[PDB]
Symmetry: C2
Subunit: 479 residues, 2 copies
Amino acid sequence: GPGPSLPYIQRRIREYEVLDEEGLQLIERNADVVLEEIGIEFRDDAEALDLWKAAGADVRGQRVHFPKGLCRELLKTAPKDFTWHARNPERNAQIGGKATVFAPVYGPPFVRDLDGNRRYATIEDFRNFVKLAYMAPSMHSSGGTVCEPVDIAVNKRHLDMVYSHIRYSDKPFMGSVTAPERAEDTVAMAKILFGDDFVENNAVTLNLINANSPMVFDETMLGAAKVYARHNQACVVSPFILSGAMSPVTVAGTLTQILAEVLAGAAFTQLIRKGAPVLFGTFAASISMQSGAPTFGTPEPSLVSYGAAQLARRLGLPFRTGGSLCGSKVPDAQAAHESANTLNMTLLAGTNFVLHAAGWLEGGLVSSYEKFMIDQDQLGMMQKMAEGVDLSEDAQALDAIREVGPGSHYLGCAHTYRSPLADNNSFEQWEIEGEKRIEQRANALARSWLEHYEAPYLDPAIDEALKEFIAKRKDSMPD
Amino acid sequence: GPGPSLPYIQRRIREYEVLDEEGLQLIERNADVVLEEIGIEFRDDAEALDLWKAAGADVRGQRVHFPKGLCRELLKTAPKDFTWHARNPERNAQIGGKATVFAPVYGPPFVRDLDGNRRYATIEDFRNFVKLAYMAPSMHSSGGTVCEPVDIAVNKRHLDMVYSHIRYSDKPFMGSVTAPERAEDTVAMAKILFGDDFVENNAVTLNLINANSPMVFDETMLGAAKVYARHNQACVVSPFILSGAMSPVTVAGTLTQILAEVLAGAAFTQLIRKGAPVLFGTFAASISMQSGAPTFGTPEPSLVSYGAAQLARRLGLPFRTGGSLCGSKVPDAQAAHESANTLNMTLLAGTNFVLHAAGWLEGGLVSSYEKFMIDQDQLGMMQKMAEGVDLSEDAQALDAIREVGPGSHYLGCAHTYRSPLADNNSFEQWEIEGEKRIEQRANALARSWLEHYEAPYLDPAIDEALKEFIAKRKDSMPD
Ligand SMILES: [Cl-]
Ligand SMILES: [Cl-]
């Protein structure tokens, strides 16, 4: 199996910037214009409209028009950083500041299984991804909807999904957002696990709250946000954008829209509870001008995300974007270039929370076991990169340079990250070993990890209470 | 075929830094210590030793010990930037400053051909790579030893290699460095092409001058450097390092050794001719602690190269490092992650000259047609990325945001880089089209490009004179 899990990354390296002060001010000014003149829809949520009117916004039907600065002022109560608590406290993760936390793929209804089949995902696959995330040394979070399990009823599956993050991992996990009652169920389960007062006082979940970009928040998302914000749980407020389709085709226009959507949605959390933890999220990709298809790994989404990180730091919210994203159907060089381009930006932008750090394929439709293994290996490289350059006397190596001297070599001397998947052997050895592509070695490694997996301890009293809760909830509803 | 070729990149984006002022001063101070106490070998070149003694260095056998600051002072005459002239002046490339110039793979004795065979490279393959580099829109240079042609005698092949860069391309090219007489032949050919006085006054070649790291320059390399520096041609002074083997295993120790080697070798060019153009080069990879094998795409080489770029800017020399480097045997996700990690650093470090920007596979032993096509596509993305964020009124897109408004989409409106190799189609379409990996599409595209290729015009009088020169030189030697 793998080594021990590493804690969250603390970046010693700098954030890479694409906008100068004038550009940042321009985008900020333009977002305030959008918020006042155009507004943001808060749909099918009368309570939300009442909250906005009370806060001093101008509500016209379902469109909320914001006085300049209001959202930013309301966000003064949001924490710049906070702890995401894990049931094993050694796995707690900082969200914000110099920290970077990797989480798995979220959302796919299909898997590419270890036998090469593209098929609907099941609870068995969900559990397998939870297991692999538990074992992956640089996967800091267990995640959320690692895949969508087809073989449990839609109104019940959330219970099994949350349970899986508790039973098969001890890393911090995400909650259900698919209906407000499911968010309530997540909170109830969390209270069984951590204690009632503990949950009211500490974030134990991050929860994905998408905007229906452009410039709409819908009932379901607002409903989950209201539950989590009332219980001190974190909302990842995330525009969902393909530039050219759900936002302008340009970087600057996309950033402006993103900032407007985040200001409104994040400020909303503070209207529910001052101090509720909230992140500035962004999902941003491009479209093919030929096809209209979603495209990844291209320059425009990287520039958007670098810029958005700058805007997030200035707003004072922890930032989520990026991951190992791609549009390829197979874990080939396209998948890898796209994922690598996105992941390198993710680290260098100083991203605090990385959804989709491993496992995404096919534009988000697939959770791939092989891809997960390849990506998690990259995550270990990013974790090591983030430590930056050691400048200790030993690292300076002057005695080694002296002792070796010109014309010698350093292999023998005392002074003199490791991928388990890269093949660094000669052609001849690699040909003897079956001319294998990396995904074949990834397949074998996933199988090996799953064979050696041992579940982290769970108090049997807590397990029983969770199972009793789940059973009661399932019995209260027909499928 | 492809679109028109683009000129050299002018970066509008910032350089990413890994060392702060104290760290930079530390490395600079430590390199001066190495140069004085340990020295650098200049082997089997009595003239070089005499030049160093005359300049005020302390020569002990073949070891040159340098007073502190001497090399840096001598380098004051080296140009911070210069033009690399092409026979078609529209293809001239700036070397230095904010410019970035991509060149092909250099060195492999094997190819992976379009039929999938790993075999010794031939002059036909050399020509094919020159053709593909001519056509690739973001390949700014024709390169040098795009592969090593096995089917021409070792003492003659340089003539055909240089000729190929003239006949099949009009982009700036590199010279032969394999013996001093071959460098003389390159200069003679260049004078036939551009004119005698033109060559003495303008760089028309960049020429790879490796150190035999650690801390040795050998006769052959010094001999080529002496020829090119006397004729105003550029030397790319390049440590050749696997950290842990040819330099210390640490980043800081590697950087110190690199800076010492470059200071000595680059200053040497100014002893031959003040003002001779010279680059700070670095080839830097790691080794597998298990195997001892060369490894790429890992954190340590990226940190070395980011740092080395900082040291190069402070020294005042144009910088070469990076490229699309990897150790994989096949153009798979390993090849792509490694190449992408290296290439993203290459751009963000502000690299001026990128050897090996496309085509390298198998740790430098292979020039791959498929890999070249995949990599050159990435180069187009890097070219577009380098332009940074447009902040024009049109790019701000406020009228588009207004006209679309919340709940609509931007696909239809007036306001609303393209890979020819990414598959961005649905699973269903991609399955109908043969479940193809990107390298299969790359194969087809290379074949298509080579079918449509038309050689750039060459004056028949110049062609005849080159052929007469070549024939005379070949007839003067047995193979
Ligand atoms: Cl059930
Ligand atoms: Cl011949």
